[PDB]
């Protein structure tokens, strides 16, 4: 056997990246055992697109991708092919030719602060929609009107990124949720 793929290094990590800074990991030259997610965390939502879910341990691929980020509780629906929204259009877009699976689960006990956690941010105002598998780690003065400003926030000049301020007392749709996306090639 030997050389088991590192799927436990991406689901049990300590710090999860922000949506606009979604990390990308390269998996190659390893035997992939998809039984690890066949029984874990009895609250997760597993959906796979482009391949039969219960045929994974029968196929040989070239490279496997893995991206991770933390989104809102009610925004998990937007992470799907052929779907649009604030997160889907503006932060992370899944193309129609997905041929991969999507995993999400509750992360209240680890991503909640009594005073409110401000470590997670997202982009609400962009100049234009992003292509599939495109990342824009760049914040710049966002002008909505016609008069430019010299790098000073104010009217018609909005910081393009917004925080989340997660709290333990919010609702199920407002609680932080950890999502990992696997892309097969």
């Amino acid at each position, epitope marked *: 056997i030997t050389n088991l793929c*590192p799927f436990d290094e991406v689901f049990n990590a*300590t710090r999860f990246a922000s949506v606009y800074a979604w990390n990308r990991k390269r998996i190659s030259n390893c035997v992939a055992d998809y039984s690890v997610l066949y029984n874990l965390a009895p609250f997760f939502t597993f959906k796979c697109y482009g391949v039969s879910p219960t045929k994974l341990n029968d196929l040989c691929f070239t490279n496997v991708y893995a991206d991770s980020f933390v989104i809102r509780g009610d925004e998990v629906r937007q992470i799907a092919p052929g779907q649009t929204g604030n997160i889907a259009d503006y932060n992370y877009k899944l193309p129609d030719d997905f041929t991969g699976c999507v995993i999400a689960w509750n992360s209240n006990k680890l991503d909640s602060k009594v005073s409110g956690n401000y470590n997670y941010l997202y982009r609400l105002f962009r100049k234009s929609n992003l292509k599939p598998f495109e990342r824009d780690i760049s914040t710049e003065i966002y002008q909505a009107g016609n008069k430019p400003c010299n790098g000073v926030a104010g009217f018609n000049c909005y910081f393009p990124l917004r925080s989340y301020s997660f709290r333990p007392t919010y609702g199920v749709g407002h609680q932080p949720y950890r999502v990992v996306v696997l892309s097969f090639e």
Partner: antibody
Amino acid sequence: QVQLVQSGAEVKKPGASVKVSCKASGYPFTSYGISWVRQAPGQGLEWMGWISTYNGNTNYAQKFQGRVTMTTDTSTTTGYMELRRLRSDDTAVYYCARDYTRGAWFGESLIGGFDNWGQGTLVTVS
Amino acid sequence: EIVLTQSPGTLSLSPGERATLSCRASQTVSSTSLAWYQQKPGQAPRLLIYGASSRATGIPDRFSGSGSGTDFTLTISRLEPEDFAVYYCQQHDTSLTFGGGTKVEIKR
């Protein structure tokens, strides 16, 4: 099952060096790391460092910044710790543990801790 | 680095009562990066609780723990005569360190 076996005790004298061996069987070796912790008789525990069994990337403590180095051999499933410039202040029991606190392939932290420990090697320096 | 502290050093309680161990931290420590250990005399330590809440494999339900931010605490529902040992609290938020240790022995 998971079992860790080490070498025997040593009676090394000052100015020398000592090697500690750690052999494991029961899990994929290229998946987890190895970490070393020492404990003087009557005192608490003390950390040394981490070694990755996948690519040899290593991380070390501050008080042992240059006094230690570690190696692994994939075929034999064994890791070695080298401690040099021995002193009478290093009379302790040295432990080998399977580490689930930092990833073997990517170097990021994980949720967990030292989950398997060996018998322990006693070394006295005088 | 984050310097850890436990108190009291030694506890003398009854074999069957309910006990509690305390661990104190200097800086803030992520709750995902704290664990506890038990060292029975004449052996090597073993893992008891990881993540400050989750229970390790092969640990009885009588063990549990809770706490966050700066003060973390491990609670034992009942004391038993296989539970007299020294315990430690760990962090690996930045680098790694071990606590001083706490010993619990029989009161008589």
